[PDB]
Ligand binder design. Structure first.
Ligand SMILES: *[C@@H]1O[C@H](CO)[C@@H](O[C@@H]2O[C@H](CO)[C@@H](O)[C@H](O)[C@H]2NC(C)=O)[C@H](O)[C@H]1NC(C)=O
Ligand SMILES: *[C@@H]1O[C@H](CO)[C@@H](O[C@@H]2O[C@H](CO)[C@@H](O)[C@H](O)[C@H]2NC(C)=O)[C@H](O)[C@H]1NC(C)=O
Ligand SMILES: CCCCCCCC/C=C/CCCCCCCC(=O)OC[C@H](O)CO
Ligand SMILES: CCCCCCCC/C=C/CCCCCCCC(=O)OC[C@H](O)CO
Ligand SMILES: CCCCCCCC/C=C\CCCCCCCC(=O)OC[C@H](O)CO
Ligand SMILES: CCCCCCCC/C=C\CCCCCCCC(=O)OC[C@H](O)CO
Ligand SMILES: CCCCCCCC/C=C\CCCCCCCC(=O)OC[C@H](O)CO
Ligand SMILES: CCCCCCCC/C=C\CCCCCCCC(=O)OC[C@H](O)CO
Ligand SMILES: CCCCCCCC/C=C\CCCCCCCC(=O)OC[C@H](O)CO
Ligand SMILES: CCCCCCCC/C=C\CCCCCCCC(=O)OC[C@H](O)CO
Ligand SMILES: CCCCCCCC/C=C\CCCCCCCC(=O)OC[C@H](O)CO
Ligand SMILES: CCCCCCCC/C=C\CCCCCCCC(=O)OC[C@H](O)CO
Ligand SMILES: *C\C=C(C)/C=C/C=C(C)/C=C/C1=C(C)CCCC1(C)C
Ligand SMILES: *C\C=C(C)/C=C/C=C(C)/C=C/C1=C(C)CCCC1(C)C
Lengths: 296, 296
């Protein structure tokens, strides 16, 4: 069911491979098994569960809010292609140096990275402005993915160097993402909204941190994980990274907008020092509306 | 000088190909010539000229301003890799369906698209804010490149569909880029700054519009252009798209910042209607500082 040459004869005591001259590409490297049927079964179950969660989040969002729906949209399109042509090129790229590259995964990443990072820069949903920091986040994150994708298509020392270049860009991304979540926390009202921001920070850093770990573990790295192995790993962190995070995002947004519906937009001036940063703290009391220099 | 199998024997009256069992990948599709030596010579000259312009812009920027330098930085790194390994994987991806994909080109695109589009959203260099429109520009443009890259790795009807999906995202990008340039024009002072904004609009739409044209013309499309042919085409629009546009950008930025040094930040309220849009028109006269509803 591959559309490369799968049938060959070994000749001159296996020193020569003879293949039909039917125009089809050939490489023994491509024919290495994708893993055990147990690995494959586990992967097909988690994919359906991903399709189901993608479906329910979307219809739920149906009852502003564009960043969460899109990530679930891209996720569903991904599953329809996986269901029919998961291991067909170009969902997997079978290349001249013998690599298998899951282009399907990196494509989704590039597509939704602006969406996620815009949403990172808008947790409350109140802002009509994005700071200079947002822009550095997008530049660094897209570089990360571009270097990483290059590293996956490469081998030997060239793969090493592009992975290192991806890590350098990635560090810049993580550093600046951390400040955003710090500002978000001290901006939102003191009650349930700060529980949810905390929840989203945890999901973000753990799920995003697991991607370079699964790169090193997978066929693109030291080949510890098989291809089905890698798929299963990806489905777990995919569920956390996309569906769940945007669901927590929408929830937060709802809570914040309902705060404006009841108490109204009552900002403060919490001057942080984690530097000499500032923040506009939404509060439920009209009285509270002054400068609270909370030097951390 | 390829690191795939280039040497084979035709057997049973060319119906069988026999290749050494040395582990190397093999496909006749990969061995198709990249073009004439005249095409190649033209490509090597325009690449050096690109390296020279990249070099001079950078040292010139050496005498805020981060978006122009970066695009020239990425351009120089690109040339060092082209010089040594232009047709080595993964600068070119030689894949199982026989395609040659110039990953080197699309990587650069993804890397600098945030940089260019942030710069689009900051022509004056005065803003510390980016509107909601900027964010739609980045989301749509990265989708464009992701669909396009998928289309280049695909064949037949799958390539068609991903190209169509790229075009839909691209239209959204062009539409919104047009509004930005309209706002930029009516924001800057009435003299030389409006000449330069006009110059950058022309370079942007012509250079960016030529990329889907060169996709359809190149090996990724109807194979009208050869690989060297495609390289030459790309060097011309590359020079316009990157070096020249950022040079015009830096020039504009200089002019605007010098306006603050002489006249100061004297805004107006030009209310456009190309809708009911608004703009803050920098003027050289302190007197002029009111609402000028110029309904277009
Ligand atoms: C043909 O190839 C076979 C491969 O199995 C050779 O058999 C083995 O020979 C090597 C010596 O290079 C030993 O290390 C192995 O232990 C041998 N047996 C097996 C089962 O692998 C065989 O020598 C080759 N024949 C000729 C004439 O070249
Ligand atoms: C071996 O292949 C050659 C390919 O050149 C065959 O020669 C040609 O045969 C076809 C018939 O299928 C004609 O259309 C061509 O005009 C022939 N000549 C050339 C120069 O192309 C040849 O018939 C095959 N031989 C056997 C025994 O199968
Ligand atoms: C802030 C986010 C937290 C997460 C940060 C993750 C840290 C990962 C670092 C690993 C370094 C180990 C080296 C990995 C470099 C990859 C290249 C490689 O495997 O090289 C192939 C080899 O040269 C030929 O077989
Ligand atoms: C706003 C920017 C202005 C620029 C906008 C550019 C317009 C380009 C449209 C071309 C449509 C023609 C069809 C191209 C679709 C590509 C798929 C293709 O070539 O299909 C292969 C075929 O099915 C098997 O051989
Ligand atoms: C975690 C994976 C999903 C749940 C377990 C299902 C599974 O793969 O178990 C099969 C069993 O090992 C039979 O070989
Ligand atoms: C964006 C990336 C999308 C993945 C591409 C998904 C498209 C799957 C292509 C399936 C394929 O290989 O089609 C061959 C054909 O149907 C049999 O002869
Ligand atoms: C070494 C990795 C390079 C780090 C990633 C690049 C830095 C991000 C960048 O270019 O953004 C500049 C922006 O002006 C910031 O506010
Ligand atoms: C910032 C200061 C300027 C240097 C920039 C980057 C060096 C890395 C360039 C990438 C070349 C890859 C080399 C390799 O992989 O070996
Ligand atoms: C436009 C291409 C660059 C300038 C012309 C150089 C060139 O390629 O001309 C060679 C001539 O045709 C000899 O075959
Ligand atoms: C980001 C993308 C960068 C392009 C990758 C450029 C790296 C060029 C790799 C060259 C190559 O194929 O190396 C083989 C080796 O040197 C011979 O045995
Ligand atoms: C059909 C192509 C899809 C068009 C590209 C996607 C639209 C951009 C988007 O998702 O951005 C929404 C944003 O909130 C806008 O202000
Ligand atoms: C917006 C409303 C929802 C539909 C979304 C996109 C349909 C295209 C999905 C991409 C599947 C590729 C099919 C192909 O290439 O054939
Ligand atoms: C689809 C949703 C998400 C959140 C995808 C995220 C992907 C990454 C965070 C990838 C990170 C990489 C790093 C940090 C460095 C190695 C190369 C990677 C692209 C795998
Ligand atoms: C390196 C600098 C620039 C400006 C690169 C730009 C690339 C494009 C504008 C590509 C556009 C595409 C479109 C509009 C649709 C087909 C697929 C493409 C990615 C080639």
């Amino acid at each position: 069911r591959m559309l490369f040459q799968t049938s060959y004869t070994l000749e001159n005591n296996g020193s020569v491979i003879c293949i039909p001259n039917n125009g089809q590409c050939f490489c023994l490297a491509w024919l290495k098994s994708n893993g055990t049927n147990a690995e494959k079964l586990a992967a097909n179950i988690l994919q359906w569960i991903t399709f189901a969660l993608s479906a329910l989040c979307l219809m739920f969002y149906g009852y502003c809010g564009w960043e969460e729906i899109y990530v679930a949209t891209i996720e569903m399109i991904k599953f329809i292609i996986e269901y029919f042509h998961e291991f067909d090129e170009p969902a997997v790229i079978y290349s001249s140096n013998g690599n298998k590259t899951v282009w399907l995964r990196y494509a989704e990443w590039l597509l939704t990275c602006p969406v996620i990072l815009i949403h990172l820069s808008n947790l409350t949903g109140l802002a009509n402005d994005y700071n200079k920091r947002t822009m550095g986040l997008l530049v660094s994150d897209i570089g990360t993915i571009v270097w990483g994708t290059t590293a996956a298509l490469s081998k030997g020392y060239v793969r090493v160097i592009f992975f290192l270049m991806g890590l350098c860009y990635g560090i810049y991304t993580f550093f600046n993402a951390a400040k955003v979540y710090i500002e978000a926390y001290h901006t939102v009202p003191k009650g349930r909204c700060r529980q949810v921001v905390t929840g989203m920070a945890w999901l973000f850093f753990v799920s995003w941190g697991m991607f370079p770990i699964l790169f090193i573990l997978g066929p693109e790295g030291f080949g510890v994980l098989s291809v089905y192995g890698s798929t299963v790993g990806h489905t777990i962190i995919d569920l956390m990274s996309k569906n769940c995070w945007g669901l927590l995002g929408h929830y937060l947004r709802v809570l914040i907008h309902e705060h404006i519906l009841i108490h109204g937009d009552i900002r403060k001036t919490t001057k942080l020092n984690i530097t000499e940063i500032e923040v506009e703290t939404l509060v439920e009391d009209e009285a509270e509306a002054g400068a609270v220099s909370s030097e951390d």
